[PDB]
Amino acid sequence: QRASRLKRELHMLATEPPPGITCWQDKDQMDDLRAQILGGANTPYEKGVFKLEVIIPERYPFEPPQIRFLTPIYHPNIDSAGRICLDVLKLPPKGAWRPSLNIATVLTSIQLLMSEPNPDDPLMADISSEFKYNKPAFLKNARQWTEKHARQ
Numbered sequence: 406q407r408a409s410r411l412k413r414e415l416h417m418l419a420t421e422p423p424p425g426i427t428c429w430q431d432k433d434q435m436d437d438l439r440a441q442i443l444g445g446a447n448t449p450y451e452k453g454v455f456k457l458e459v460i461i462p463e464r465y466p467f468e469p470p471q472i473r474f475l476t477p478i479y480h481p482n483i484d485s486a487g488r489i490c491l492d493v494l495k496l497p498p499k500g501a502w503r504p505s506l507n508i509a510t511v512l513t514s515i516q517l518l519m520s521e522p523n524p525d526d527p528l529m530a531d532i533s534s535e536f537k538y539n540k541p542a543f544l545k546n547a548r549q550w551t552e553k554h555a556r557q
């Protein structure tokens with residue numbers, strides 16, 4: 406059932422990936438994956454390439470994929486170790502993971518989170534206040550962080 410579902414998902418990611426998103430097997434196992442999200446336009450992350458680690462837990466699809474950024478990113482919801490505060494990556498009642506979602510849909514949500522942060526549920530408190538109260542300085546720091554760590 407699990408193995409069977411992962412094959413369906415890998416196939417879909419290889420053939421019909423979402424715009425801007427790529428995901429693939431590192432080795433010869435279906436539960437240790439990698440992905441890549443391209444920084445969107447009309448965002449400070451633009452022209453940046455962000456790599457992620459995607460671990461599929463042993464009880465998938467009843468527990469969510471465990472995802473973290475490997476490429477540094479300056480964002481209120483993402484910490485210095487790459488942990489993402491996002492509802493679709495957490496179990497209910499607080500979270501919104503359900504088995505009718507998949508790897509592609511959560512990667513797309515992380516992409517949306519990059520365009521549209523939530524300072525209501527921050528992981529980086531100083532970055533979160535800068536985003537609310539000094540928006541131009543946030544945008545400047547994000548673009549600098551992008552150019553340094555996500556390019557060449």
Ligand SMILES: NCc1nc2ccccc2s1
Pocket residue numbers: 474475476477478479483484485486487
């Ligand atoms: N591994 C992803 C990240 N690494 C870092 C390091 C410093 C600040 C922010 C980030 S996000």
